[model samples]
Target: IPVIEPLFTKVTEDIPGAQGPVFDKNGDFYIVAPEVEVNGKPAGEILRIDLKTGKKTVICKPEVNGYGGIPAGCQCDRDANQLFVADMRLGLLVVQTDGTFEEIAKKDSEGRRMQGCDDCAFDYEGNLWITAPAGEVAPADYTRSMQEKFGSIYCFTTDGQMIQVDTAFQFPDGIAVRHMNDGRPYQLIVAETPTKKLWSYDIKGPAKIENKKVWGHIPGTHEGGANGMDFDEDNNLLVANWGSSHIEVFGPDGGQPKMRIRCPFEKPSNLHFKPQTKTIFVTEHENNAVWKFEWQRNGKKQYCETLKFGIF
Candidate 1:
């Protein structure tokens, strides 16, 4: 019964199929639009937004001259100033600010091609976690089938190790990591969109986890569930309630939402908090736009932002 209506300011409303809203070390904002076209093809692009002026610029088109890209979730390793993407068509990738890119993984360690990459998050221990939510179909023949085929969770460690941690989910979409006060990973949280539940795992070590359980359930009646999420300084989980048009907040106990902020759009695809601040940025599919607002607490520092390259 604890919910509050918050006011949000529209940042920009022109992105087509907007998804992520991660920020880089230089405070530059980045987002992905999988429907942006290049040469009349579905060439997904990465946009860099100037927070001061709300200006949007295309910094990288990952699939312009190649296979179509369906980039979804993205994160910035602030120490390296590199952006990581989980794409349905292009697989996992790392992109430079200057528009250059490299593939991180199109296949797993067992030489199996990734079914499809959807979302990703980094841990304080320098491990990159990814979610693959699609079936085992080639990029050129891809379509949305929510069947539980090869949907899984993957972890890529700093020392160059890729491990498939879990599998057989129905459209696992969003991911976030919880850390202890000393910056050690405490729990790994992932959203099973089709089930409208957030799953949690106890972190054993780098690329290792155990004891999977239902962390919480999302409140919504539409087809979509939880899409993207982040943590606040007080350890509360903030989830983008896609298709429900709300930013739902749940406590560490993982039950119903303690607060739900209504969104202006129908589908809020994802959200991220500006570093060292209480201001949050949201990306929505309804208007393909980005919005911002203040929150009650500052955001917990993301693992990627606190760690440095080769410092593990």
Candidate 2:
């Protein structure tokens, strides 16, 4: 086993092609395939993947709601029992304990539709923040709206109500936020895909996403742009790119480009960091695949153990 080969290991392949990959706390990795119109009704498929065994399963094929939309980004409750899905049609859904689901947040109080529920993050207080881009470019699906902004982020209150925290980017791809610790609210870092930049802001108090700043700017290729993002324990930002063949790991230096782990398996549609195993799992939008990369750490900067690849 050459050192480089194991560095970018491909643990799985051939996926139905979707996004909204939810990691069950320390359990398995879950991702969804876009809904295809079946029998005049929408069919959204969700898959559960085991990191250690490299096993995968179609956990659910829920009947579609919200005008037949695809599943985008996703998250799980602290228990990982209930899975919150962002349907492309602009709705927040929860896959309940049993295998059933509920459409919790359909429309904001303003009556504006939840058309582009692309990605979401839960604050330490369990508040849900969602990224609803105006421009539609979901895996095999998309939409168009008269709204001027191509990006929108919202906060869902406990009562199921909502507040527009910010809407000033062109296609917000991924979002990660700080958990309130010791009663202190923290900052948030968002991936603005189209402009190829990561934006940050203060998330505190009533409707305050203040001190907007550019945390980091990652350059992308014409084949693809910035996509899903996850933060590691060391405050490093691991970003998946559009067409580029790897996940770029950034140091805590605001958002500097650090390392690139090639994901030639398929262009990754989303990215997730599993703290339990210190692994990075990626979902491809064009295929039913979620590959996990395990990096060797030396107690300092996380480094690629060495060279590696499962592919020839």
Candidate 3:
């Protein structure tokens, strides 16, 4: 296994609170730092970072007063013209390339007000799947019963129709979908942040989820909270462990992580792979840095190289 090296440190201490990291078709990187305080209050903003120069640009600042909280997970469409963000403070937000923000979907399939939407992923059908970790907005010391009723995964079509999958998850956060090499359509993979388990949902036949099988579990590793996940070219699962301070790589079939690479900083949240360059860009939330890693495979093993870093 290859060890990780620090790429670049914080570019701006003023806005080092970066979260989700994604890439556009043109190789540009985009991340969300929703914790920017404006006038002593939180003002959620999406930031675009130039991959080459590390320059940060404010794309749009979303209004979170009416809805509820802050923006969490984000994913762009195939064309990168529209970005869908999970506004855990309020509802689902759609931000166009023109810098316009709109609430796309909020309620569940039954039209009930959602508790809290955290993370999301887009499927081959152009549907956006979101994770709602209810009870997260409650006070840190709040009782579990008061905040544990609504952790679920929901799906919404591009046209804004919502479908409640109602999968049992305890504080679900990160999500990803990939097609099997057998030519099957795709399957859903989710990370239960609190449980430190990865869940799988098979969409090949009729959207039937393969019961909660343990994907990756790092015992005694921090708080057992995990975040974003994606599949590599060979179909290995790449996971970001929020509280573990490392990125764990699992084999294509799942189970224990095939390899674990330490993060140069704390709280690594989300990650995106640039297909053209085979580079993995990871968002280090607490450290205020974005790290780059190059993946290579030798025989039956895969290794990663810590490329330079870009501060966002």
Candidate 4:
């Protein structure tokens, strides 16, 4: 939902490399901020943002691939007790409520090493949807001219099975669920980084995909491209323009911008809505900060309280 009424104001603050953000059961905002990066050798830590006061602190710092891993993307279920994370260093991991995470799927069913695990989400059927992009060996030194279309979309089931949906996705970077409770079939939407676009496909059962659609494109960016994306009942889409410093909103079509929330932070990575508080939050990658906003569509703080969390 665009929150048609739109609030008269918003909030922005500091938290580094705000990628893969979601809310905990207690309404606490947790984000993967790679605060420390000298050469990507394990200097970053996941941060916890307070919902009511906007105060942020460290939840846990994690290690990946026996080296250092950057917090790329993260997801959790409704219980909010368990979590899932996609790491640039390690691959795919599962996090316990206590913040301890263990590796789940790094190699595909064929035993191929999943190069870079970027973003992830769980479907209504309890399947884990993940984006593994074929990224350059060094994250900072990467560019489109040197890269190829080698990204893949995958799903992991609760019974411990890893399945592939599409193996030729273009720089799969972000994940989100779509069309819940509309009496129509639901789908999974992904933000393709290098291409600066969005893709949608059916989540047929736990291991199949059908009716793949181009979905649509965002406003388009050249800096770093579009990163993470989310949608609401109104079909309003909000995506982080990585190098653009703008959180562009789109209509249900996912094409032209419906509204633009210009921000101070450079390269916004991810944005999410906390239903319990009727607030929205965005994580910035380049500026190392996060911006919080009150989603008062009708001058109400609990605007979408009855709505549960989305995959983001």
What C-alpha lDDT do the candidate models reach, one value each?
0.83, 0.64, 0.65, 0.65
Expressed as tens digits, the lDDT of each residue in 175-281 for candidate 2 is 87754324344777787776768888888753468898988877664555677877675666777777666566777666657676666654767876564456666
TM-score of 2: 0.80
Best by lDDT: 1
Q: Weakest 10 consecutive residues, lDDT, candidate 2?
A: 298-307
**Local error of candidate 2 at residue 109 (angstroms):** 2.6
Candidate 4: list runs displaced more than 4 Å: 1-14, 38-40, 51-55, 134-146, 182-185, 296-312
Stretches of candidate 2 off by over 4 Å are 1-6, 35-42, 50-56, 63-66, 134-148, 179-183, 296-312
lDDT tens digits, residue span 1-312, model 4? 232323323333565566777765556567786556656455566667665676767666666444556667877665445567777666676666566777675566767655557788666566678887744323333222216677777787768777667876667887776555542326777878777677878866766678877676666446576788766546577777788767777666665677777666567788777654445677776656666665433211111232355553
Q: Model 3: per-residue lDDT, tens digit, 232-251?
A: 76777778888777888877
Best by TM-score: 1
Residue 123, model 1: Cα distance from true site in angstroms: 0.7
Q: For model 1, what is the C-alpha lDDT against the true structure?
A: 0.83
Cα displacement (angstroms), candidate 1, residue 257, comes to 1.2
RMSD in angstroms between candidate 1 and the native structure over all alpha carbons:
2.3
State TM-scores per candidate: 0.94, 0.80, 0.81, 0.81
For model 4 the TM-score comes to 0.81
Give the RMSD in angstroms, all C-alphas superposed, for model 2: 7.9
Q: How much does each candidate deviate from the true structure in C-alpha RMSD?
A: 2.3, 7.9, 6.8, 5.1
